[PDB]
Amino acid sequence: GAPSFPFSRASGPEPPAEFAKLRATNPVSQVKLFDGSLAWLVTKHKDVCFVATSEKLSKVRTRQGFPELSASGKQAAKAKPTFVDMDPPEHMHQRSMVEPTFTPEAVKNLQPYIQRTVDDLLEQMKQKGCANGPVDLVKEFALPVPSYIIYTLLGVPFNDLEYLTQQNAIRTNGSSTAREASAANQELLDYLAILVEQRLVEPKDDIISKLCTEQVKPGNIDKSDAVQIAFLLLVAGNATMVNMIALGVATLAQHPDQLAQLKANPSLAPQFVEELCRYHTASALAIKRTAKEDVMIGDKLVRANEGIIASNQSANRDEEVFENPDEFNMNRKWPPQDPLGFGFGDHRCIAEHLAKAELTTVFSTLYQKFPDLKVAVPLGKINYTPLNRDVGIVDLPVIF
């Protein structure tokens, strides 16, 4: 029978072993989801791009055969959708309401603020020190950098950042009870609703205010929609950002020649970030569709109302695109084809430029501030996310 999916990672920092075998012998195959239903799994870079762009495929989760991967996903699919789950024309109708903050030009103009945020958190880490033992690079740095930035862009005032960063972390922490995670989720929604009310009365220079002035007041969306769009922008990428920062530090510890390169030349940070986003595809479960009509993919017929999962993680290890794909090599010569860490097509991560700027700022600054930063536990004992989840690191003891 069809194997259960998601697959488990082969070890803490490695992709599932199944993908390499599937790319070689069965690149479009059926898998069994948590509820016993079947879905198609696509593993080659070319086919992942096809799935991401075909207008014969839908992200609408109320369609028959949509590949929800858990009971919580089936429950979430009942809610009113935001643009992440929309097809044209609704998708860009709503996404364009918030895209301006995320353009290359806007993200370039944000660079001094990104740098200040990273610098301030590094200085707080220095002042706290590690004189009594290792400290957790996740809690002290990888968590607040993306959290403070997206909260600030949305419109949260500075004094509220630390508490709301902690609450949003509780939401997804693997140690939280269900009650604890649900209470933190509702606290974030309650806070955002009050912020939307405030910005309807007195808008400021932030994303929520722009939604209020330009879409809520004119009746293009309502205020509960504005809350949900803001919430999507917070929760869609934050855990992935935290994991990418921590994975970057661990990857450099595992590759000491490349770390020494980066310590000696911070202008290598962009190249490092490109290879990191290919090699550790920390969001690998989001390119999902159902077929609106029959569609042929490779040697398979995907029938109408059948589900599809396109693994951008597998695509990023596709030997036919990336030479020596399972080596981390920030000095590689890149091919014509895009790495797919941020997806592809109309739904490609709205925050791709922001995320790369955050990551480039982190890795061009971290080892200037802390040239002796070391992972404090043996690398084989790093606390990775559980193997049946997206790759990530829960906590990362360091000294400096």
Ligand code: HEM
């Ligand atoms: C290194 C960090 C990140 C990675 C690797 C990442 C990756 C991804 C991927 C793989 C997708 C799916 C794209 C597709 O459907 O083809 C996506 C979509 C999305 N991401 Fe991210 N992301 C990151 C950071 C962020 C951040 C910081 C935000 C918000 C500020 C964000 C918000 C979103 C949203 C809203 C979508 C849905 C876009 C749409 O369907 O139109 N992501 N991201």
